[PDB]
Design an enzyme around this catalytic site. Structure first.
Site, mmCIF file in Angstrom:
data_model
loop_
_atom_site.group_PDB
_atom_site.id
_atom_site.type_symbol
_atom_site.label_atom_id
_atom_site.label_comp_id
_atom_site.label_asym_id
_atom_site.label_seq_id
_atom_site.Cartn_x
_atom_site.Cartn_y
_atom_site.Cartn_z
ATOM 1 N N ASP A 36 -3.675 -12.211 7.203
ATOM 2 C CA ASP A 36 -4.745 -11.368 6.434
ATOM 3 C C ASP A 36 -5.955 -11.296 6.823
ATOM 4 O OD1 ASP A 36 -5.838 -10.631 4.010
ATOM 5 O OD2 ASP A 36 -6.155 -12.467 3.189
ATOM 6 N N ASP A 220 -7.188 -4.045 5.483
ATOM 7 C CA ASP A 220 -6.593 -5.196 4.945
ATOM 8 C C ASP A 220 -5.034 -5.271 4.822
ATOM 9 O OD1 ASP A 220 -6.412 -7.500 3.493
ATOM 10 O OD2 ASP A 220 -7.954 -6.915 1.844
#
Ligand code: F1H
Length: 356
Positions: A36, A220
């Site tokens: 992440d 992201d």
């Protein structure tokens, strides 16, 4: 160079995230860990939640050290909560090093772990400023750089429908074609960038670029969709709808409320004054097989999620405060149109596109 043993070290399911194998504690406890770039915490399951294949068992690790402090982490959808400490971490299919990193032992969570998923934790690769509870908890990658000779750099090749590669400490040149193109990281918190022009099927949206970065624009790997701000989303959808009048679709489908084309270009700020490059995605990228419209409105800004990342090899060049884009060797291209990274372009007043 090569880093061949790190190639294809990511797995997942569509819309369910990309994960690398990691070990924690002594002896090594193996966990699958979500990758992440939109967060900065290394956090793992440490209690027998039903959805989990496995969990961090602290009582089994000799090198574990309690930090005697709690952490509460609410996301938009759901929360997790845990007990902080440190322990020896490795990435089996990464570099041959072992580091003492902060681990958040998740004791309690709501809407975090997915029933049917094959991961047990999360690796936040972003910067300290967004690390919870505050900027003093050193994020994993920062500890990795500080404790070893691994260069302050990592790259990602996420391959659409699920696999990919996280190259820690370098760039594997086999994973991309053509030239890398770098955009500056605006501030080191999220991986924040500046989008300076948007074209739907080679036609400008004619919008103020300050709108494209409404609040922020970020890369992201934890987000699935391309998340465009409300104002930009409406103008983009209307334009995508305009190109797609050959076929018919419900009004809720574009809103992400149902199931079942133009290329989309994002011009990003270049390394040089008045210089830009553009990254281009095919329909293959924003039409996610379950088919769903993988572009959605947002209040937090533009989130260049897996939709974008799956077309490109992405270098997080932390050392040089910049992010590299190249055509991914693994993106879903047909015989007509191929995803592209093109430059240079002339673009004035790019600095004005960043919201303050
Ligand atoms: O908050 C942001 C950036 C906002 C602009 S979009 N990203 C989060 C970071 C945390 N991540 C965890 C997560 C990832 C995959 C599945 C479940 C949870 C969700 C996305």
């Amino acid at each position: 160079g090569s880093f061949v043993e790190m190639v294809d070290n990511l797995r997942g399911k569509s819309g369910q995230g990309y994960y690398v194998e990691m070990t924690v504690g002594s002896p090594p406890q193996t966990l699958n860990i979500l990758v992440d770039t939109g967060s900065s915490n290394f956090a793992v399951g440490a209690a027998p939640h039903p959805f989990l294949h496995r969990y961090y068992q602290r009582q089994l690790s000799s090198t574990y050290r309690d930090l005697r402090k709690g952490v509460y982490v609410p996301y938009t959808q759901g929360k997790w909560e845990g007990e902080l400490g440190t322990d020896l971490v490795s990435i089996p299919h990464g570099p041959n090093v072992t580091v003492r990193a902060n681990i958040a032992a998740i004791t309690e969570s709501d809407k975090f772990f997915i029933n049917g998923s094959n991961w047990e934790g999360i690796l936040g690769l972003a910067y300290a400023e967004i690390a919870r509870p505050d900027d003093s908890l050193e994020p994993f990658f920062d500890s990795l750089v500080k404790q070893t000779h691994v260069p302050n750099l990592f790259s990602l090749q996420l391959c659409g429908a699920v696999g990919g590669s996280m190259i820690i400490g370098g760039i594997d040149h086999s994973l991309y074609t053509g030239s890398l193109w770098y955009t500056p990281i605006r501030r080191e918190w999220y991986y924040e960038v500046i989008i300076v022009r948007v074209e739907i099927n080679g036609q400008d949206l004619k919008m103020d670029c300050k709108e494209y970065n409404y609040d922020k624009s970020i890369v992201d790997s934890g987000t699935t969709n391309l998340r465009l701000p409300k104002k930009v989303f409406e103008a983009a959808v209307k334009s995508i709808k305009a190109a797609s009048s050959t076929e018919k679709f419900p009004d809720g489908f574009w809103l992400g409320e149902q199931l079942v084309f133009p290329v989309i270009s994002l011009y990003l700020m270049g390394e040089v004054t008045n210089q830009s490059f553009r990254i281009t995605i095919l329909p293959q990228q924003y039409l996610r097989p379950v088919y769903k419209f993988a572009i959605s409105q947002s209040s937090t800004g533009t989130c260049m999620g897996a939709v974008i990342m799956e077309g490109f090899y992405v270098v997080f060049d932390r050392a040089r405060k910049r992010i590299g884009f190249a055509v991914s060797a693994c993106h879903v291209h047909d015989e007509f149109r191929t995803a592209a990274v093109e430059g240079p372009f002339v673009t004035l007043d790019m600095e004005d596109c960043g919201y303050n």
